[PDB]
Amino acid sequence: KKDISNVKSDLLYAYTITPYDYKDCRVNFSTTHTLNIDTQKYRGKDYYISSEMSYEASQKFKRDDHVDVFGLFYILNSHTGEYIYGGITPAQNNKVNHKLLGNLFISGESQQNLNNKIILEKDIVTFQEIDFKIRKYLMDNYKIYDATSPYVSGRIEIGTKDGKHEQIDLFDSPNEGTRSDIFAKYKDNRIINMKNFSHFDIYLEK
Amino acid sequence: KKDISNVKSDLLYAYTITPYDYKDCRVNFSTTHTLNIDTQKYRGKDYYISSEMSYEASQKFKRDDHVDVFGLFYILNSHTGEYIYGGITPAQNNKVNHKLLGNLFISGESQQNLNNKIILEKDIVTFQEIDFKIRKYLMDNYKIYDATSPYVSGRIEIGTKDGKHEQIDLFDSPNEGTRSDIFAKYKDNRIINMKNFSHFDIYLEK
Numbered sequence: 001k002k003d004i005s006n007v008k009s010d011l012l013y014a015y016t017i018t019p020y021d022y023k024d025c026r027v028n029f030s031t032t033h034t035l036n037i038d039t040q041k042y043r044g045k046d047y048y049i050s051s052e053m054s055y056e057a058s059q060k061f062k063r064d065d066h067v068d069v070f071g072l073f074y075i076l077n078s079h080t081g082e083y084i085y086g087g088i089t090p091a092q093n094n095k096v097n098h099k100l101l102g103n104l105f106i107s108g109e110s111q112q113n114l115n116n117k118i119i120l121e122k123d124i125v126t127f128q129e130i131d132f133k134i135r136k137y138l139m140d141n142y143k144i145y146d147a148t149s150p151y152v153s154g155r156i157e158i159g160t161k162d163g164k165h166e167q168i169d170l171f172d173s174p175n176e177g178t179r180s181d182i183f184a185k186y187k188d189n190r191i192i193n194m195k196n197f198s199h200f201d202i203y204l205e206k
Numbered sequence: 207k208k209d210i211s212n213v214k215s216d217l218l219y220a221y222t223i224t225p226y227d228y229k230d231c232r233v234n235f236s237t238t239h240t241l242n243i244d245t246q247k248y249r250g251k252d253y254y255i256s257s258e259m260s261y262e263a264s265q266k267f268k269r270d271d272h273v274d275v276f277g278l279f280y281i282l283n284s285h286t287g288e289y290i291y292g293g294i295t296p297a298q299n300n301k302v303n304h305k306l307l308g309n310l311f312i313s314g315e316s317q318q319n320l321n322n323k324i325i326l327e328k329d330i331v332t333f334q335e336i337d338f339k340i341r342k343y344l345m346d347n348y349k350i351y352d353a354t355s356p357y358v359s360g361r362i363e364i365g366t367k368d369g370k371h372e373q374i375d376l377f378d379s380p381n382e383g384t385r386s387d388i389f390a391k392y393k394d395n396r397i398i399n400m401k402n403f404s405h406f407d408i409y410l411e412k
Contacts, residue, residue, distance in 0.1 A: 029284055032258060032386060033239060036285070046252045046286055052238060078235055079242070080252055080286070180238060 010177035086189035216383035292395035
């Protein structure tokens with residue numbers, strides 16, 4: 001397997017990044033595996049976002065649909081395009097604010113309360129957006145990916161109102177551990193409806 | 207299976223098209239499944255070709271390589287991009303002319319000589335380019351895809367100097383029979399070196 005210090009290294013680099021956050025963009029057209037979205041209003045002439053997704057995900061969107069974008073690039077220096085995986089939801093029409101409830105469980109420590117630290121402004125959100133914001137919070141506040149951090153494993157659990165949980169591994173660097181490898185998981189464009197969202201639980205093992 | 211008149215219908219439409227033929231273009235960058243190539247000198251500002259290929263094929267090309275393009279689009283009305291499958295070879299440096307030798311075998315007729323009808327100007331060529339030129343010749347001269355054509359099956363056989371043959375089905379319309387379906391086969395970017403090329407044989411069954 002891959003050694004923990006390499007994993008952290010990969011992730012520190014990969015997630016130290018500025019996400020693309022564009023609201024209400026029109027889908028120009030679909031390709032075999034991607035959606036080409038108009039971001040000219042934000043980035044200038046001829047600019048577009050190229051979102052690679054699974055077939056099932058893509059079929060939910062068609063030419064001219066209005067969409068919101070939240071994704072992390074896996075390529076740099078790419079002309080008029082910005083390349084990401086998934087990160088697409090139907091455009092949010094009315095303004096909205098969701099203050100998330102959450103808890104932090106660090107090995108051998110007492111539960112920490114993280115309520116209201118993370119706020120979302122969409123009713124329908126991608127796991128990619130949720131994942132990123134939480135990781136960033138953890139990186140910023142707990143330096144989870146620093147070489148000297150004591151964490152050796154951990155995950156995020158998204159809890160829904162039916163009592164179920166969705167897990168997201170926090171220390172996984174597949175294949176060569178490049179952004180393309182690490183962000184590939186977002187290609188399913190998994191989304192969650194805030195109305196079903198309960199709270200999140202983070203587990204870090206020392 | 208698919209009925210023959212539908213197949214011909216699909217192919218008539220699909221192959222009635224003007225190919226993109228651009229020489230000496232620079233590769234801008236690679237994505238997970240495509241190559242983004244600079245065609246600004248031919249199509250204008252910000253224009254590019256996007257060539258989708260198999261992993262193995264793509265790895266043969268890197269940023270800044272000079273390449274020649276010969277491909278058929280599978281998408282229309284796509285902004286500053288032109289989308290195709292494969293169709294990429296290392297740029298041809300010196301001028302060249304290859305007059306191909308070939309034969310036509312139509313069921314119950316005598317062999318027809320097709321020598322020198324098809325000419326190539328590259329030493330290294332894609333099957334896509336070879337396939338297209340021959341099909342077009344057949345469409346133009348034998349109307350193989352017309353509803354009233356008598357052909358019910360057939361193929362092209364590319365013969366190499368070692369005595370081997372590569373077959374290309376002339377009447378295959380997979381899946382929904384869209385250009386995306388029919389041209390997907392070109393994604394392997396299969397190429398042939400003219401020095402190994404012997405002649406081609408076409409078989410049409412009535």
